[PDB]
Design a protein around this ligand. Sequence first.
Ligand SMILES: Nc1ncnc2c1ncn2[C@@H]1O[C@H](COP(=O)(O)OP(=O)(O)OP(=O)(O)O)[C@@H](O)[C@H]1O
Lengths: 523, 83
Amino acid sequence: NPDWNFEKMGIGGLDKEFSDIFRRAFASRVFPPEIVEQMGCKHVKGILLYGPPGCGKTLLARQIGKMLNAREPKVVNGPEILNKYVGESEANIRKLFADAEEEQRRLGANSGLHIIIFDEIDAICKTGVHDTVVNQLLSKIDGVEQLNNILVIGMTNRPDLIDEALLRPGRLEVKMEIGLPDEKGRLQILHIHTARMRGHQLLSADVDIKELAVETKNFSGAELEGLVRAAQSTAMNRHIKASTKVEVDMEKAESLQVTRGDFLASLENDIKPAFGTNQEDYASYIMNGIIKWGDPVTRVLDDGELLVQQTKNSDRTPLVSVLLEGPPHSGKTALAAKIAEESNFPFIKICSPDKMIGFSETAKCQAMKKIFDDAYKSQLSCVVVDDIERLLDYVPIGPRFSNLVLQALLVLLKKAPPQGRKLLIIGTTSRKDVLQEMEMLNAFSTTIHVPNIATGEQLLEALELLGNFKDKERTTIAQQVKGKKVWIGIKKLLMLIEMSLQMDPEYRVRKFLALLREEGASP
Amino acid sequence: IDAICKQRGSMAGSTGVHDTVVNQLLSKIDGVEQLNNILVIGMTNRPDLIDEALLRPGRLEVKMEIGLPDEKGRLQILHIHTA
Ligand SMILES: Nc1ncnc2c1ncn2[C@@H]1O[C@H](COP(=O)(O)OP(=O)(O)OP(=O)(O)O)[C@@H](O)[C@H]1O
């Protein structure tokens, strides 16, 4: 039988798609032809493969051409059919059907299978020349005479611009989607390149190919080869003392080694990716780390762990929400980012207003919808939304705000993901009364409170952990602040310390204390 | 180079002479026959108008940006022109 493997194709994921085809898309072929003719059914003869540029599509087509006792596939590269003279292109299109018609007449459908490969079909299919070509191809594929031994495979990166009539059933039946070169493929390519040098013992042992493969992301085979060549260039130039004139070469220009340093230098400053990659700048939201100046941090973190484990191991509460609360400058987004990082989930993302400046309500709604749609594809995911009041931009005058964003958030806060999947949501804000007065506080399942430095001993402990002031100043600070309560956030404390450290040592303490007096307050 | 090479299509004419030129150039630079004793240098003011196909691995694939000079460059240019 066809006995699909998909490991035959030397790739990954095809498991699912191969299954599809072998079991149900294609199957009439294996079935006895007489019964197929007797009842009905229709052999599939149209497959379209769409995805970003890569070597997977051509390799898959070659594997299929090896996946059957067929002829040699006929491949046309680009719009070579187009001709200056009238009539040549459609003539050639018909000329391609040579052996097919030969077998479709001498043995009809009872002959060998014919494979047709189209590269960048979008160029030819989408004014007289183009419409004539499209009509000729459509008639030849499906016309008065039916061919039962021709298969057409097309590859494109812009499926939206293909003719709709070409997607009618019986012309392009099967749809296939492609992706990018995975980590295992990148390792295979790097091994196919490097090994040659490994055999000659010319490669430094310090090189670790796994690390290089990990660093390279979104790099195709050509890009990896270019990176290797640039590493070779940086290695060989060590002996090329060329200058304004060009001396070139030395007594050690041979027996060269593509060292790791050359690889890294070429990767950073020589060869740039043509697509880039993702980005997770947790350092942006966590710039100065977390310092345990008291008990509240531990309480917040423990509640976060409890919520995470409830989300992970629940059956009838697949969706859970929580709200971070506190006064301004209390450090709320950093704690949420820390909890998300400690979650250890496959999918984590942050929605922040810093990425939406000058947007209208519709753009913000579309961005949020896209993020949640992406989150709905994984098995268990976490999402954090910070500065809710800056999202539905709010002003105490009027008051004024955006209703579309508020309604979208209210709808999204209680929509469960598809069956068998888990989602966690963490929201941060510094204005609870406003949200409560909007009837939005009842959507969240629970809340947590972020406090501020209250007692002087906590301030002294924070100073000691920061390690900025010495014992002499600490004695006076404790003397003057121990017998009184304080009210300050950590971010403001860092700002005050940085501001006060500018002046000369004789005044610093006083200046600092002066500032601490001006910023004092009570809840 | 941008005068000759522009994105395929995107032109309103019946002759279609702006596409055959690009296709012939692409075939000759990188075709079935392997020619490896040539180097092509192309300079332009508007890199965007160039057809995307010509800018890729194999075809061209090394691109330099010449920017405004710095204080040292200005000094060198003035010295050169005042020598
Ligand atoms: N124990 C801590 N908890 C939280 N943040 C801390 C802690 N120690 C140091 N930090 C740092 O203090 C800063 C807190 O600022 P953050 O942006 O988290 O506060 P915020 O209340 O969200 O700000 P704002 O109210 O001004 O929008 C961060 O740089 C964070 O890394």
